[PDB]
Design a binder for this molecule. Sequence first.
Ligand SMILES: N[C@@H](Cc1c[nH]c2ccccc12)C(=O)O
Ligand SMILES: N[C@@H](Cc1c[nH]c2ccccc12)C(=O)O
Lengths: 244, 230
Amino acid sequence: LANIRESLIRQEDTIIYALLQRAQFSFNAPTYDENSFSIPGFKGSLVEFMLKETETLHAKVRRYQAPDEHPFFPEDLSQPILPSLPKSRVLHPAAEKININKSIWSMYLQDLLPKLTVPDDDGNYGSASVCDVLCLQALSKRIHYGKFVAEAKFIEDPARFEGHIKAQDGDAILRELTFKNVEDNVKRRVANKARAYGQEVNEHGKVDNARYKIDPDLAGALYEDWVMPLTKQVQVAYLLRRLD
Amino acid sequence: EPFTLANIRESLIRQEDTIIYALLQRAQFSFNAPTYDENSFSIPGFKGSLVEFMLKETETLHAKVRRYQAPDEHPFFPEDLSQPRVLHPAAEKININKSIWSMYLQDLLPKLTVPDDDGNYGSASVCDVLCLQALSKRIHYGKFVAEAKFIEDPARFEGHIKAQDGDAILRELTFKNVEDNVKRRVANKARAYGQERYKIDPDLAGALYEDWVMPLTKQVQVAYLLRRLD
Ligand SMILES: N[C@@H](Cc1c[nH]c2ccccc12)C(=O)O
Ligand SMILES: N[C@@H](Cc1c[nH]c2ccccc12)C(=O)O
């Protein structure tokens, strides 16, 4: 695993696509302001509505039965309408329950999105909110996949971590974690993929003729700055609970 | 702005990317036949296939927040459309989503996916919905090309429209060299995603555009222009 490296890459690619598509629209402030829209029968903003309704539909087809899928509205999980899949046994049962979506929500809306977009309003609230939901779900999956990354690192050499864990020494755990290949050189790699989206095979365009609005270097810096620290926090949180 | 000839041209080329990427996402999962069978699952209060359910539910959500008020956005289930002047009013009547639905599910999807069942009914159907919506927007987009072309040079079409000569209009809209380059570009865009053989088969993407996407857009354009003098 290895088998995880390819998973991580797809998760990264999915985030890059989502950010790129969201960046096709402006900030569109009313999308996030419940006092700008009175959504009939619902208390909350348009993005909250779109996310809540999306999770309702996705829960019905068993999305959150998967070990890598975490709901932003866990207290509103809708009943599935498909036969249940076998429950995953890969992660440590005591450590697998981690859900930091509240942190991911505030990161996206407050730290990432305002830097990602032009602050004006182009009126495309519907499109923006749907892009937002895709961003949120893709960010959540990548960030929480730290549980699988950490489990892999642990299983390779448990004694490497077991002393730190018994001591609840989060700083030491962090220092024992290595971040290589996909976990490194993130800014440039993400920037390069954002630039390459929509290109023909081996087509190399100058910045002059970019067909999408997103700033590729900005996308890479935002991903490294705001996405990567949260996924390391998840790895540390997972290992702290790995002997629970 | 969004519907000048130049802006439309660039939108169409962005939609190439959107469609190829949507297909790529769907092709990460197998055909998963129970997704398309009415008899497979017990959906309470619903008659139809899972993909039908997922699309209907998604159209209900999106209609509520005004998606189908956009002239380029066309529901697959207008009879079930729930409550929330670029084009001639005749555009509102033109919607060939039934043909797009059949093409996607019965022609494209078996070619796109591995024939078996990997159990991922939820992911597959969510991906189906995005493919369908992207195909629909692109194919119906012709409306904007036709309107911008008519606005710029009405005398080019007015005679054919007065004569209701659809074939003549179709010839006017056909640029074979341009179409050949679209096919080439789309295949190469698919090819750019590389191998997992290919993640999204270049020849399949090229064929989709040549056999279906460009012919059906033309069919929409002719249907629109024929009614443009009403
Ligand atoms: N872009 C338009 C129409 C639209 C496209 N996709 C949507 C999805 C949901 C709601 C609206 C839309 C809007 O935001 O209103
Ligand atoms: N793998 C399951 C559950 C699932 C995982 N991710 C999803 C995303 C959307 C819907 C469902 C899912 C399925 O595809 O059915």
